[model samples]
Target: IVGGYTCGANTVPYQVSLNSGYHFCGGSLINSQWVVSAAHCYKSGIQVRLGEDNINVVEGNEQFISASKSIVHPSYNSNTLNNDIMLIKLKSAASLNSRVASISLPTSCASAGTQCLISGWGNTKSSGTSYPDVLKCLKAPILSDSSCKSAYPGQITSNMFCAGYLEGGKDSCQGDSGGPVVCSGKLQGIVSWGSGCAQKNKPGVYTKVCNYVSWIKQTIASN
Candidate 1:
């Protein structure tokens, strides 16, 4: 996370580490048995690490659970990154506690200019080679779809929205995918993509969670 600082322990209980022997992406626990993330983050043999603030340490409350299935949005277009959201079904329900809790989904769309908190263990900078040992967080402001479209040109779509400052210096980078963008105590978006980290006029892009509420609900209900 460019321009982000280390986050407090258990500050984001719903935050999870999506790992394949090692941390690869970030995710959020929306339900005891379900996790939400970015479609581009999918890979084989992925595991979900919950109640963890540090990636290397084995915390007492941390639980590593196998993913029974990964459901990517049928309309997801990786080429354009449209419908970039995905869901992971855990093999067993997570044991909920103070250190492991689910986040509430948005009932309505987030307004433009809303400020949100993003947390992950991604890179500290765009050119950085190493990932943080602990989780990091940064506050980002939501940009209007028009402004986002200006920044990304023909790349921005309705399913996606932008966050972070136009001046740059704060954003989610590689490995931060599938993480939560919490606004007003609700899940507003998922860390989907960005252009070279924290670049001026290039804010971080996210999958607008509110746009797929019905799909998410149906997927969970049927699965």
Candidate 2:
């Protein structure tokens, strides 16, 4: 992410890497065997890597598992990017410890103007061509629907929310999609898309997680 720095090893234990054979995306573990990410991140040969800070090096605490199943939101619309969320079930469960754990899903809506944190291995700059090997974290503020609407015009929807600076100093960039936007220590949003990384008045867009809590629970329960 733009203006982000290397995060602590266990600072975001729920964060995981989604390797789509060639590229990697960010994700959050909601449970031992389940992960939630952006629907657009879905791809064949997806694998999950847990309890790791660096993507290229395998740590002793790291647990690598293949994806046994993946489910995209039934109402996901790529054209307008509505309901841009997805769930993936690991072939084997992750063993939780001090360095590995699941994040709590929000039971209520995230309020506007809340300061939240996002962690991922996304680019450090908007014009950067490479992703960071180590995980990075950034603090951003949630914008109201009105503000977001003003920035995105007719593109902003209720299913989505905006976060980051309006002045264009910090934001999630390329390879950051599917990462967690944690507010008040709870999972509130998932990194989806944006006009451009850290562009002025163009805050990063995210899938509102609270809106689909029921759907997430039901999907996990059914599976």
Candidate 3:
């Protein structure tokens, strides 16, 4: 498995050179024109591979779109990790196929206790080797609003959502931020933070895609 989003260290994992590699975080195929992903995952001149098996090894249908522009949520502050969300506009449009298809963004935002799917190269357990070269996936149950509050206790804001195990052994870890969190088969959230990778009683936190629908729509619409 590989890491989510792009970073200086082990960014887009599997590629020894951090500068050149495929580290595309969760993206929703809004249409034939654009795909949505966390801006933090975007690196200038970096390549975005879709529907690939091995993020670091496999060469699949790729869209080498230059980052025409990046729109981070106005309230976003990387220092404090506030309003942690953004959208990258592709200079060129993508052509999706069976191997490479678009994921649908959520239409109806579900309440707490909703179940979802989370994927990435983040370790399955709290620590150890981040999977092999293949993409690793896991079922993350939606955390109740109260449970989320109890889990974070003033740390969480309205801009985020919670997903993962109550026991905390399994979850998105250090390298999993900015990946997709799907609810009812639609893109709902992006991996953001957690108490500690897979720590017990700590649920994984995510940027609520549903809450930023307007920003997403406007960004994509303008681009």
Candidate 4:
């Protein structure tokens, strides 16, 4: 996350790292056995590390778990990055504790201008990799759909929304995909894509999580 600060341990308890030896994407624990992330992060043999603050060092609070199943949205369009949401069921339930827990799904849509929290262990530099060892956080304001449409033209979809500065000093960068966008303490978005990291008029685009509530519930229930 460019222009962000290191988060205190346990500050973003719901956050998890999708690891294949290295942190690749971020995810939110939505239940003891389920995690929600962006479909773009989908892959086989995923390892999830919860309660992770610094990935480079041992944190006794971390929970290493394997994914039992991964469900990418059936409507996900890789070309346009639409319906970019996904759910992964853990092999076992994550024991809830002070440094590990799940977050609530949004009950309603967040309106424009909502200041939301975006956090991850993603690259801190826009031009190249600078993966922060510690989780970094930033406050991004939700932009109106029209504003996002104007910025991305035909790329903007109903399943996605924009949040960040037009001048772009702060935004989610590479490796932040599948990370959370929490507004009012509810999961509102998932880092999906954008033109460039923190580029002017190219705010970070995220998966509109509120649009997938029913699908998530049904999938979890049936699976």
Candidate 3 vs candidate 4: the TM-score winner is 4
lDDT of 4 by residue, 164-214 (tens): 999988999998999999999999999999988999999999999999999
Deviation of model 2 at 171, angstroms = 0.2
lDDT of 1 at 216: 89
| Best lDDT among the predictions, by candidate number | 4
Total backbone collisions for each predicted model:
0, 0, 3, 0
lDDT (10s digit) by residue, model 1, range 40-59 = 99889989999998889976
Model 3, 1-223: lDDT tens digits are 1223322222122111111344535444455555555545555664444445455554644444454566667787665465777665556766655544556777878677777767664554465654435556667678877888898888788877788778766677655566677778688887777776777778888878888787777777776
lDDT of 1 at 7: 85
TM-scores, one per candidate: 0.98, 0.97, 0.81, 0.98
For each candidate in the order shown, give its overall lDDT on alpha carbons.
0.92, 0.91, 0.61, 0.93
Which candidate would rank higher by lDDT, 1 or 4? 4
What does candidate 2's lDDT look like per residue over 1-223, in tens digits?
8887788786799999998664478899999999999999988899898888888887577888899999999999989899999999999999999788999999799889999999888878787566788889999989999999999989989999999999997999888999999999899999999987999999999999999999999999999
Q: Candidate 1: where is the Cα deviation over 4 Å? A: none
Worst 10 residues of 3 by lDDT: 10-19
- Candidate 2: residue 87 lDDT (0-100): 98
